Symmetry: D2
Subunit: 505 residues, 4 copies
């Protein structure tokens, strides 16, 4: 007999695991428990803070929900109006020393004239071939050339996507992008070139809210707080070291054993294979691909420069900086960095030289969060990446050479993005059903490895829907039909369902 027995054990307390927990807690039927090796829940949706008081999320995190259930839980956890800030998405792409509104492909109008001709010519060729196309594109690259043409492909899509995905567009599938990659309309785009008009509204994150305190991690801390504490085990005491799939037993680092009837595993599935000592699973998970994410944080002295303004996040396709994206993190909340009266010495100027004075001085302060991808196809020198990011901020004119840096942050996240490679699905349809036969629901950004349903809401609902399948025979819609859930408002499932209304009387 194990030290503990539950009907449903949940491994991991990032958004996916917390979703499972919240639904299990709502249903209030089967016995359950949730573990995490980190004292603080949140996973990749956590927030660090530097010794100088600058917060950094794990790169640009912005909340946009496809589901009422997710909204209910966020609202329950942070109920007050002042718990949140609402923002309009101000996003641009850096091209030829100018800012082009996102998305690039919908704003050819803001490019130099020569590039406009190249881009429109390409789009015209794409339009004409699309008129007689009877096959579907097989790769990301093919999709790009078919929907946008060579000009936009060469000028932006190919270099940008390598820079973020850390693999070439030719290596990726194209079934994942319905809600990620705007397909430009030939008429609309040439119309906007003629009129000198912009088109900045595409996509589900054109408007967003952000938590007032604690960064994104504050959401997940607060959501986890609504759970019955005795059913949680966060910390070294919650680290899973072994999974015995055959005896339905999990063993924690400190030796505690947990018996389960059903397992919801949200750890990276490659890690799960290893913990299962299941060599067949290990070899299959090794066929999957992922990129690592470097997050670099820079804290800067001074009121917000006019050149920065209300910008939220910014894309960098070009080669004068190593990061693919920058977020003006100080625009998301005034509590993402120190108050103006906080005294901090300058650590260095942006040009890398030492400050004239070592004296602690006041603010105000603003804050830039940078992301740099890494993979076996795109190596990164970890020792120079911080300095390279800062010089890149100078190169791109985000920072003046004389700007004063009062805080820095660098952290590498090994599992950053699950790459939509050509091989992904062939591999997953071997992995998942083999786990499913053992009553293991492997779910989440790396639990199920599907980026198109890899945001916080998707993740949370992967957890919720796993529970709903386990208990109520629900369809795992988010897991198996990304375009379906992303294309509709999912209003049916609520934090209070009829089951609870009826049972209360």
């Amino acid at each position: 007999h194990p030290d503990i027995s539950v009907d449903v054990l949940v491994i991991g307390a990032g958004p996916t695991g917390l979703g499972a927990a919240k639904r299990l807690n709502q249903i209030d039927g089967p016995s359950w428990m949730i573990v995490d090796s980190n004292e603080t829940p949140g996973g990749l949706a956590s927030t660090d803070v530097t010794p100088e008081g600058f917060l950094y999320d794990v790169g640009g995190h912005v909340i946009f929900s496809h589901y009422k259930y997710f909204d209910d839980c966020l609202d329950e956890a942070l109920p007050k109006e002042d718990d949140w800030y609402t923002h309009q998405r101000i996003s641009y792409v850096r091209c030829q020393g100018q800012w082009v509104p996102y998305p690039f492909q919908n704003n050819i109008s803001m490019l130099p004239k020569e590039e406009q001709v190249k881009c429109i010519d390409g789009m015209i060729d794409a339009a004409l071939e699309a008129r007689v196309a009877n096959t579907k594109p097989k790769t990301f690259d093919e999709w790009i050339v078919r929907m946008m043409g060579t000009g936009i492909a060469d000028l932006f899509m190919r270099p940008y996507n390598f820079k973020v995905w850390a693999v070439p567009t030719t290596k990726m599938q194209c079934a994942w992008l319905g809600e990620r990659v705007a397909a430009p309309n030939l008429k609309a785009v040439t119309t906007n070139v003629i009129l000198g008009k912009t088109a900045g509204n595409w996509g589900p994150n054109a408007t967003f809210r952000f938590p007032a305190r604690g960064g994104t991690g504050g959401i997940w801390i607060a959501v986890a707080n609504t759970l019955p504490k005795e059913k949680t085990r966060f910390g070294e005491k919650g680290k899973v070291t072994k999974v015995n799939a055959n005896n339905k037993t999990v063993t924690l680092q400190d030796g505690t054993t947990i018996g389960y009837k059903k397992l919801v595993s949200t750890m990276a599935v490659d890690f799960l294979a290893e913990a299962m000592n299941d060599q067949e699973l290990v070899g299959l998970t090794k066929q999957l691909f992922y990129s690592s994410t470097h997050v670099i944080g820079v804290g800067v002295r001074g009121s917000r420069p006019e050149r920065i303004g209300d910008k939220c996040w910014l894309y960098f396709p070009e080669d004068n900086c190593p990061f693919y994206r920058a977020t003006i993190f100080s625009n998301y909340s005034p509590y993402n960095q120190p108050e103006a009266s906080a005294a901090l010495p300058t650590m260095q100027l942006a040009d890398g030289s030492r400050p004239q004075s070592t004296e602690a001085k006041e603010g105000p302060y603003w804050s830039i969060m940078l992301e740099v991808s890494e993979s076996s196809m795109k190596p990164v020198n970890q020792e120079t990446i911080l300095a390279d990011c800062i010089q890149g901020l100078v190169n791109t004119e985000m920072l003046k050479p004389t700007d004063e840096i009062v805080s820095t942050y660098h952290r590498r996240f090994d599992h950053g993005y699950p790459t939509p490679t050509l091989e992904r699905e062939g591999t997953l349809t071997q992995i998942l059903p083999k786990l499913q036969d053992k009553d293991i629901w492997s779910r989440g950004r790396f639990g199920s490895w599907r980026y198109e349903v890899g945001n916080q809401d998707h993740s949370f609902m992967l957890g919720v829907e796993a529970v709903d399948n386990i208990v109520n025979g629900a369809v795992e819609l988010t897991l198996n039909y990304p375009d379906f859930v992303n294309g509709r408002q999912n209003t049916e499932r609520r934090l209070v369902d009829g089951a609870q209304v009826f049972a209360k009387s």
Copy 2:
């Protein structure tokens, strides 16, 4: 305060209502109750019998299940292997003196060559056009011609569908057919023509099962029997006459009042609006279109003729018979008609003449079930339709003039098919949201009026999913996404889910 109060009230005990009831019974949470004006549950999935002992379903009823949950409930209701008979899905199209295997286009080698030429030319035109198509068809008619070409459309799908729907194909939408591209398989069709080959779309793995006893209606009696009797109210005592949606009160014919928190209504939505005395909904539901169904049954003396053979159901595009479909119902179960030793007098011969003798003779017997549609655009003379069907049987060479008819059956079903008109969705998306705002789940063949999710399995699951929506916040997939549920096997939901395992 009403005589009875329940959390969820279910109106109607056809497949849809029985689905709601089965799921509620499984969940064993909220209180509930199911009513029907008929003593026998089953609705349009019920079965009649003539005084001569010949059963007739409400027209051809062949089960193809898209759902494990539905299978679970059928298996539970009729668990024994000898409760069912299995058959291949054998069907033909009657055309120009031939039984052409379905699908029609793969079998046109049976037609005269000159006709084959016109068919192939038309399908070539359609394939060339499909190659450069950049719009979807807007009408059923457009969809038909783009798939088949002119000549083939004119021979089968066009005239057949008018005889079925009782409205022209030019007046119907085509989204209900699903997302498949409307385009010919030119090579498959031309290949069979070149080879002089025929081929039906059936075989050892393309089968259906039919209940051994009581016809299709036997399934629903069995399913209903698994319910707690006290939570059902079937018959005159269960007829709903008034629905006060603001009080959430329903009034029965005998005067009994039922209070509910949520209503699952499976009656025809047009009757619901009348029962609600809601003038806006009456006006809206009166904008929907439907056809009535005449079911004609003919019992015949003799062993099964070779010309009939293993045929299951048959299509009639031509105008030498009024029915659009015939079913050799005697092929579905031996118990659909009397045993061979049963003695019955001949009522008439197939050509209408009187029999030589009035004496009762033995069988064996076989049985034909016919369907004729009726709408404002296609009237039916109820006084001659039986005789006209029987003449139709002679014209189509199903019966010889000498065949001895020993039983006849005719019944008209007012609400038979809900029509996928071009206007349907424009109307439904005003009716359904309004009923939803009043906590009324109107669901079913005429509850929600969507033919593409209008079979027994869809109907059942419409009731199941409505309850799952009410209780567990489930998505109503069958209701809103027919292509979704029809394109996959729905395995997740079971008669025994985790929740019931953990509870015990």
Copy 3:
């Protein structure tokens, strides 16, 4: 027996007849003569002069030669370099207050933006449609729309062509336009729009030459002059009144009769039929359609205005003027109008008002030549047309209200354009063979009624080739295969052929 007998009789001494005569003269085999009712050769390629000394051709006459033989004859006729002036082929379209360089579509950058948008959108439709087109257009109108799209077609080619042909574009065939595919050059059009530029289809290479003296008519006087005078009969003495086909006899005004073995007739075929008293051919030729041409000339005082500049001919699609084309005729040669020292009084101001003085003043002078079409489908008030044209010049900003007009000219030419109606070929394939069965070669702008080979060079060569068919069995390429002769370098036939080189030895 007739008064005169020849092998080959040529009726008409316009370019077609002169071509026939030049080839007969070169061949110097069969006997021949050429007659004309006019003492001056040239036909519709003649030139008038006003009492004030302003020359006017019969509307804008610009030579583009497809044939070496035609070049040879023009050179022989006017051999000196100073017999010609050379000009670039400079033309514009008057549209919405702008002079848009030709071709119209490559220059829509001059139009307002919202209109550019509508033009480009329509041309995009046209390009997409052209990509899947498997049929040839059947009318002029369909051809226009397929080449240009709706918006651009509505701005220029549609209203302009109605004003030219005096019949709707929907009533004309399109084979006469050549074999080129009716499809947009979308990239060239959007590229000039994107670059905001203009560009006409002329330059140092795209030029025409124009006779230094006597207008276009000086060419044909000089060509005719190389003929043996005794073989010509020009004037009232040369007017044909009767053609007896069955007897092969022609009768002139003064009662003179000419017998022939072969007849080359260049008179309007409908007139030929009348002259033949052939009721059947009369009935057929009346089924042909033609427009009449009003030529209006305006002589103006002043040096050439800057706004006019080097413009040569100009197109007018809009209805603020009755003319479809204007020519800056004073730009073709300084001898098309009086020298600056010549003195003329002002007849009226461009706004119609009387001049302040009636005194004769000096120049310099410039000159405008306008064309107005007329047909049953489009009447012309011959009494107001001059004044309407002059108002048109003001409306189109060609003339200021103050401009001083010193000379006016108006002449109506009954057979002006042979119309390429949908019916034209069905009628001509009945007419020409019947004439051919009688050894009658009916050829020329109205001799054979085919606009696409209705220019000076085509006409001249129609006569040349008819003679060559008569004598040497040559194929009549120009007559029967317009696309062939217009698409190739016609260098084989020369004014001096082997036959003449060999004979003189």
Copy 4:
């Protein structure tokens, strides 16, 4: 100064040279003469006879004319009705034991059902792709696949064409085939498949005439006979050995020199380059490609067998025989082989065995003429080719093993077909104009190397038109525009033109 001096020298007296000569003789202006290294004119349109009395043309030669001028000359040369026989083309393709009516691709209906499926499927794929194609095929092979599909390509077009052309279809251009390779109509072909109908009327030689005596060579002997003998020089005395383009002098084998002003050369252009001692031209002509033709003749004892019947010529794509074509030469004229009363011993049986006796027996007789191609890509064993042909006749059931052969013929013609390679036009555009600038008209099947205009009537007219260009400035239409001359009735040029009629008066 040279021994002889003429305005126009014609080298070669095959159809092309005789065409030149006939026209120079009709014009009767410039002096001229014609020379040939052979005493009997006719070139590749000549006829041999075996010692046993069996005639053989140089492979299947059948007369079909696009030109009245050609007709006039044949009719003048052989004016009597009994000089000619008229025949319906009866032509088949040997495929899988069956005779498939010509053209193969229009008679899929005669193939076995399984092959019908493969062929139609292929034609369906081709039709669908052709619906959206916007590029011309570049190679013969591409054209084949595009117009007929892969089933017919593999079954018939690819093996058959290598077998005639002696190069693979991938090496040839496709601009030459308008009148040679039928493009099948999907509806028509599948309709005949369904109805079991044949379609055997395609093409310009569906009906033909053949001279009653002397074989094809009889025509050119008779045509040459109409020329002034003193202007001809045929035999060793007329063999050109040297051409000096700069001096415009030709040297014959016997040392005779001839000065010309204009040269019409009809010898193979590669021979001309060598004779010119012009290394640059030799180098260019070596870039052309040609196949050699082996003609094999077999005379057979017996009345015409029923399996042969009225067959004219037959095609053999299969590798069970070396010949690409067989002609039933005895069907063309009763005078192509001996009378029935002639006694001839049996030389061999068709199975290869010697016959019993040397007894000379009577006929009647019939005759098969076979063609085998050869090139550097397709060697032929000359020592066995006769026996291989005869065994081929047995494999294809044309001859029974016991058939008695009474005469055999074999001759190799070095230049047989000028191959339409991809490179041909590029090379000819460097060759022909260079010769033209030296007053050399190189014309004919190997004079100008263009197969699409390589028939007897084409060749003749290339000579006629060259003279017409030289004397009268005519366009050389056949040479430069094969589809033009092949698609029209060429009726204008006659043996008696207006010129001769007028001068005779």
